[PDB]
Write a protein that binds this ligand. Structure first.
Ligand SMILES: Nc1ncnc2c1ncn2[C@@H]1O[C@H](COP(=O)(O)OP(=O)(O)OP(O)(O)=S)[C@@H](O)[C@H]1O
Ligand SMILES: Nc1ncnc2c1ncn2[C@@H]1O[C@H](COP(=O)(O)OP(=O)(O)OP(O)(O)=S)[C@@H](O)[C@H]1O
Ligand SMILES: [Mg+2]
Ligand SMILES: [Mg+2]
Lengths: 178, 318, 330, 257, 258
DNA sequence: CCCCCCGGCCCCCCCGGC
DNA sequence: TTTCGGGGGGGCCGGGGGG
């Protein structure tokens, strides 16, 4: 939206300390060639998105500390994404980045989307059971959509008749916290 | 003799979804997916020997047909599946250009996915997300909890249930008809009882009994298939009198060659799963069994220690 | 290694053919029938120490392939590395390739598989499944709880029982014929009793007894020789000690225990085991007596296993037996 | 095996071209038309752009019925190419809607033919339009000299600063352990023109670049004896290696002031 | 130091012979008799068999009173061998019922003496006589060409399929990133006979072999400039490299057709 | 004589029941 | 926190080969 050029990294790429130093480190204060050849005033600047930051393993060679150091002198916007903020591996990011929490979305905020999907896909969904589906997925919207896609292949009507079986079958067994 | 007879588990391995017994709703869903395509990322979980690998392979075959060789990448615990493999070979397969019909996709079958490391699973996330337009992933495992939550979120969950005795009997009858095996109802009942819902175990036991004795009846079946020792342990723990429990321990377990460590571990498991007994009593029995297990692990694995454990259990029960 | 006569008797009498394995008639017959008609499945041999599992599998391999069996089988045991990498490379290559010498099927013998890691066992699953057309696996174990359920699901199980008395008698007769030895019936009975179904113990004790005789040719092995070489209590000693404990007073019982032990330097643990065996057959009116006996004697055995004061342990045995038997009156 | 047939009379040329920019980009879209072959690739950091052009004059027999786009993983392509000798002819064959292409190594003197199949990749990278621009500085110097200077300076720091002023070229590196400098002036020799360092400066220039990108760029020095560097005030630097009937171009974005 | 005494004029010959198969097997039993030295070993996977024969003519001096078996570990022997120089003569010495073997490097011009001792190992691997077999195809080709083909195709896949048919030999590999195929034909040149490709065919053959085993086998190309491959549908492939007074043979079992 | 590829140690990080 | 042992992944070091 803000007219930036995205340089994205994830767990599918090597992000060790050596690769980080020889990789995105040079991109902190470097112009984007694509931005120059695609000429907004911010199109020439990078937005470094480090996704799945918790997916890198290693006390020092992993590069978590190196990323934390990078966060203190980056000359371009840097956005990190992780699933577990309180893990010990994330300690270096204590007070160096602006923390933004994404909470589990409530049923109401997504009832309209679920109804739109249900009618567009031409299968009937009861709005009174949607919350239950959310309870099955623990607020995982992707999981809810996958459940609808998989169930609708054979059962074209979703209501209280089969809500219990569907919820029990797709229950997300997440390990509890201490 | 240097010749081998093909095992019946392989010879009569189902080749189509319609030949798989049990879990009817899931099989029908897979059949519908094969007819219509658009197979999603899926995770199939369940107990050993119920037809998970068979189901995945049959689905892939029905989906791809002649293209199966090019469009299927199969990896299991016997192959290299490290983070480097995920980052290079799987990525290359996902990015590969392959012209397919207008409702089919390339398939990556990660069998025994519960053995994969956390790093490889994490690396698989964006690979699945970015290349879903042409590639789909099918995990097969025994414990779905070993699969990290992000991967579960990306896949459709299919939990396979245990096979009922009816389905095992049905498949065994088909195999017997196809093999012309002389049998008796009692022998088939014994085979089903010993299998405990394991189709592979049932078929292997049937083949071994036929090879070793010919006629499939209770005597031959039990000669080939020993009575499971967990049931003997349960009978020992449920005995009313200490003398009966000691008799069972000495005759059915100790004189048959079962090790003390095996006996104590089986006792712990059976006591854990003893619903007929009050939970507090079960906890006391577990305390005593754990004392005995520690003593055995230290090195004193004698019949006297097991007898003392039984005496303490009976004293608790009284 | 100059000759086979320099080997210990446990190894010098190792069976070389399936006809030299005793006490496992059912298993031997079944496996012989399997091999005869080419219907050998993946095998599991579960049993206690020294029952003939390794001997049986080696004899089966020799029968299948003949004298040149070592080069046509892949044998791995706890002394060799059997990590996941080994399964991935060496076992896979052996299972997926043809035989160098003949055109027959291939045999992999995982002796002492209960020491294998869980990762290697899991890796073995699809290896066993995929190459079952041309390859077969044999697993050997003493402890079944160390084997994953997936591996057990793919194997046909055979249990090796403790050796019956008749089989031990036949093997003893063969050994006596070969060694030109003489054994009395009482000595044979004592040897069988102390064997506890393990052939290696029988062979080792027989070798020691032969070494004990001044003239192995003319002299005969008597029960006295066995008790001396093994340093074990005689049945009469156990009977006397138990009778003194049950009937006599504390001073007399203590004196009798000390005298019996000092006569031949017997160990207290052997006396406890013998007394437990004797008391097993005793008919007790009250179950509480049995409970006390078992619990206290097990505690004493565990204490002895870690050392401690021997005299106090003997007095504890005496007191435990007396207190337990005091419950047979009321 | 009819639409695209492109023949190199030695297989060494294609291998050298691929090795010129193999270490900077991985997935490349080769667009082949009647005129020739072109390829535009963007590195992972999105700061270096590689543009390769090969004309029809560089082929013994080039034929292409209609334009075709081939997705190439450079690692696999190099692995395939290393199986061929220089004395042999290399023919690239591509058919309609190709899931793979054929590389044929043929030996004229012998009767040995080596046929390899390379699986193509699905690449959806956008094509960038490079409009002609009037650079304020244009220099040409032997490739070996530039490679040596870059390699020497990269040992000190990760950033190299290039200053162009009146009849003066300066390359400086400043790091933690220390710093280094190198100064050159335009020079022409009639006996050895191949070492004639030439500069054409309209306005003074001063630009900083990353060491790794320059080390990747200089790897193409083997393709051309000389190398041309074009620099503008606030535009990416252009490094050009000329071929017999083609070119290899590296557009490197500088560091912000 | 009298029972067995063998002399190599140059120590490089024995080093190269050992390096020819040091990466294939680890434990080897060398049997020395009055007619020379032989050795037979099987890799850990039991897929490859190495058979080495060295005749008396290869030695400047050779004496072996009675047959002697010496069990050796390859890495230790190679480590000892690499000490010697290329201009020093080598001498292998063993006594009656030895527990070790002595390697002596001599440099008469510099009067340099280097003595090394290697402890022997007890190996119960009896020499298995390889009964002669008739092969459907027998092809002799330069070692360099075969090594180049193996190295090129092994990159594409872990298995290499060799087909021999009428006046044609084909090496094929199929892998994840692509496939490769090399076709060669018989050819004889009188100007350069060393480069000739000789093929004798009785029945066509088609066998698949592991790439790693072929990579290990080609390491013997240094010993001989040519390699002879004998292939049959019912027998393992035989790769032979000829020495001055002996040979090195690799018997490789093909992969199961399934 | 110098540079690059690629096998092998060396180290460091993380489960360990069912 | 952590008393062995196994497995995996990443970093250098160095042998060998090629130009
Ligand atoms: N539902 C089934 N119907 C028919 N045969 C079955 C069925 N399940 C298992 N079998 C038989 O047992 C053999 C093995 O089945 P598998 O699909 O390998 O079980 P599995 O659950 O994948 O085993 P694990 O989890 O890897 S131990 C099949 O080839 C069939 O012959
Ligand atoms: N059934 C038997 N018949 C004859 N001798 C036996 C028999 N069982 C054991 N022995 C003897 O004891 C020795 C050891 O036998 P093994 O076959 O090694 O027993 P094992 O069951 O394999 O021992 P473990 O499980 O590794 S402790 C043999 O060499 C024989 O001399
Ligand atoms: Mg399975
Ligand atoms: Mg054994």
């Amino acid at each position: 939206e803000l007219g930036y050029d995205i340089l994205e990294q994830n767990a599918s790429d090597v992000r060790s300390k050596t690769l980080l130093n020889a990789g995105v480190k040079n991109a902190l204060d470097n112009m984007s060639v694509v931005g120059y050849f695609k000429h907004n005033l911010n199109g020439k600047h990078f937005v470094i998105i480090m996704d799945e930051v918790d997916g890198m393993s290693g006390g020092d060679r992993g590069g978590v500390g190196q990323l934390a150091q990078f966060c203190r002198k980056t000359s371009t916007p840097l956005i990190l994404i992780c699933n577990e903020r309180n893990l010990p591996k994330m300690r270096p990011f204590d007070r160096v980045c602006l923390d933004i929490q994404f909470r589990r979305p409530d049923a109401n905020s997504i009832k309209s989307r679920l109804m739109t999907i249900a009618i567009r896909e031409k299968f009937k969904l009861d709005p009174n059971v949607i919350d239950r589906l959310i309870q099955t997925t623990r607020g995982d919207i992707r999981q809810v959509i996958n459940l609808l896609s998989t169930i609708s292949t054979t059962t074209k009507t979703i209501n209280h008749e089969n809500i219990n079986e569907i919820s029990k079958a797709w229950e997300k067994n997440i390990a509890l916290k201490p | 003799t240097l010749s081998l007879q093909l095992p019946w588990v392989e010879k009569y391995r189902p080749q189509v979804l319609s030949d798989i017994v049990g879990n009817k709703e899931t099989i029908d869903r897979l059949q519908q997916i094969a007819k219509d395509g658009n197979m999603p990322h899926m995770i199939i979980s369940g107990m050993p020997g119920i037809g998970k690998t068979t189901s995945v392979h049959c689905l892939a075959h029905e989906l791809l047909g002649r293209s199966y060789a090019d469009g299927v990448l199969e990896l299991n615990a016997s192959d290299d599946r490290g983070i480097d493999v995920v980052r290079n070979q799987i990525k290359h397969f996902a990015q590969k250009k392959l012209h397919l019909p207008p409702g089919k996709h390339k398939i990556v079958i990660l069998d025994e996915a519960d053995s994969m490391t956390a790093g490889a699973q994490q690396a698989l996330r964006r690979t699945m997300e970015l290349y879903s337009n042409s590639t789909r992933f099918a995990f097969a495992c025994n414990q779905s909890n070993k699969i990290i939550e992000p991967l579960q979120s990306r896949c459709a969950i299919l939990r396979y249930s245990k096979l009922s005795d009816e389905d095992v009997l049905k498949r065994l009858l088909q195999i017997i008809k196809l093999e012309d095996v002389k049998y008796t109802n009692d022998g088939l009942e014994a085979i089903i009882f010993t299998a405990e819902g394991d189709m592979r175990q049932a078929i292997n036991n049937l083949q071994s009994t036929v090879a070793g004795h010919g006629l499939v009846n209770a005597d031959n079946v039990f000669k080939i298939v020993d009575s499971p020792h967990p049931l003997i342990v349960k009978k020992m723990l449920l005995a009313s009198n200490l003398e009966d429990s000691i008799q069972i321990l000495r005759t059915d377990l100790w004189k048959k060659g079962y090790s003390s460590i095996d006996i104590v571990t089986t006792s712990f498991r059976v006591t854990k799963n003893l619903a007929q007994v009050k939970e507090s009593v079960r906890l006391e029995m577990i305390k005593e069994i754990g004392l005995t297990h520690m003593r055995i692990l230290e090195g004193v694995g004698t019949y006297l220690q097991l007898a003392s454990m039984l005496a303490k259990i009976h004293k608790l029960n009284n | 290694k100059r000759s086979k006569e320099n080997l210990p008797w446990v190894e010098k009498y190792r069976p070389e053919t399936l006809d030299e394995v005793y006490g496992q008639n059912e298993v031997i017959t079944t496996v012989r029938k399997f091999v005869d008609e080419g219907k050998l499945p993946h095998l599991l041999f579960y049993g206690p120490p020294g029952t003939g599992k390794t001997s049986t599998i080696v004899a089966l391999a020799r029968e299948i392939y003949g004298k040149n069996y070592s080069n046509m089988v892949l044998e791995l045991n706890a002394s060799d590395d059997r990590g996941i990498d080994v399964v991935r490379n060496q076992i896979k290559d052996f299972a997926s390739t043809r035989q160098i010498f003949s055109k027959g099927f291939k045999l992999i013998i995982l002796d002492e598989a209960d020491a294998m890691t869980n990762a290697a066992q899991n890796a073995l699953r699809r290896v066993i499944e995929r190459y079952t057309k041309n390859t077969r696996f044999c697993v050997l174990a003493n402890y079944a709880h160390k084997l994953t359920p997936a591996l057990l699901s793919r194997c046909t199980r055979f249990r090796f029982q403790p050796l019956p008395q008749e089989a031990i008698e036949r093997r003893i007769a063969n050994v006596l014929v070969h060694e030109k030895l003489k054994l009395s019936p009482n000595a044979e009975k004592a040897l069988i009793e102390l064997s506890n179904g393990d052939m290696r113990r029988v062979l080792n004790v027989l070798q020691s007894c032969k070494a004990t005789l001044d003239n192995p040719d003319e002299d005969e092995i008597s029960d006295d020789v066995i008790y001396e070489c093994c340093g074990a209590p005689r049945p009469s000693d156990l009977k006397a000690v138990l009778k003194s404990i049950l009937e006599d007073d504390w001073g007399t019982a203590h004196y009798t225990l000390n005298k019996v032990r000092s006569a031949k330097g017997l160990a207290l643990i052997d006396l406890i085991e013998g007394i437990v065996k004797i008391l097993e057959d005793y008919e007790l009116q009250n179950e509480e007596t049995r409970v006390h006996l078992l619990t206290k004697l097990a505690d004493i055995e565990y204490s002895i296993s870690k050392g401690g004061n021997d005299q106090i342990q003997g007095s504890a045995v005496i007191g435990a037996i007396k207190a337990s038997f005091e419950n047979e009156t009321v | 095996a009819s639409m695209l047939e492109a023949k190199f009379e030695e297989a060494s040329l294609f291998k050298r071209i691929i090795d010129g920019f193999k270490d900077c980009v991985q997935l490349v879209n080769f667009q082949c038309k009647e005129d020739g072959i072109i390829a535009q690739a963007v590195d992972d950091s999105r700061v270096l752009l590689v543009s390769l052009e090969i004309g029809v004059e560089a082929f013994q027999e080039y034929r292409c019925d209609h334009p075709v786009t081939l997705g190439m993983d450079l690692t696999s392509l190099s692995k395939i190419l290393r199986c061929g000798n220089n004395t042999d002819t290399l023919t690239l064959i591509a058919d309609n809607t190709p899931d793979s292409i054929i590389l044929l190594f043929e030996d004229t003197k012998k009767d040995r033919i080596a046929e390899y199949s390379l699986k193509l990749m699905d690449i959806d990278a956008d094509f960038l339009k490079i409009e002609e621009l009037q650079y304020d500085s244009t220099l040409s110097l032997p490739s070996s000299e530039f490679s040596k200077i870059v390699r020497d300076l990269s040992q000190l720091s990760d950033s190299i600063n290039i200053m162009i002023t009146k009849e003066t070229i300066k390359f400086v590196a400043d790091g933690d352990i220390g710093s280094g400098s190198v100064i050159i002036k335009p020079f022409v020799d009639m006996e050895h023109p191949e070492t004639s360092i030439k500069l054409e400066m309209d306005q003074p220039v001063d630009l900083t670049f990353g060491a790794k990108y320059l080390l990747d760029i200089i790897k193409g020095s083997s393709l051309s004896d000389r190398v041309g560097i074009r620099l503008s005030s606030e535009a990416p630097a252009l490094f050009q290696f000329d071929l017999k009937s083609g070119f290899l171009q590296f557009f490197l974005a500088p560091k912000f002031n």
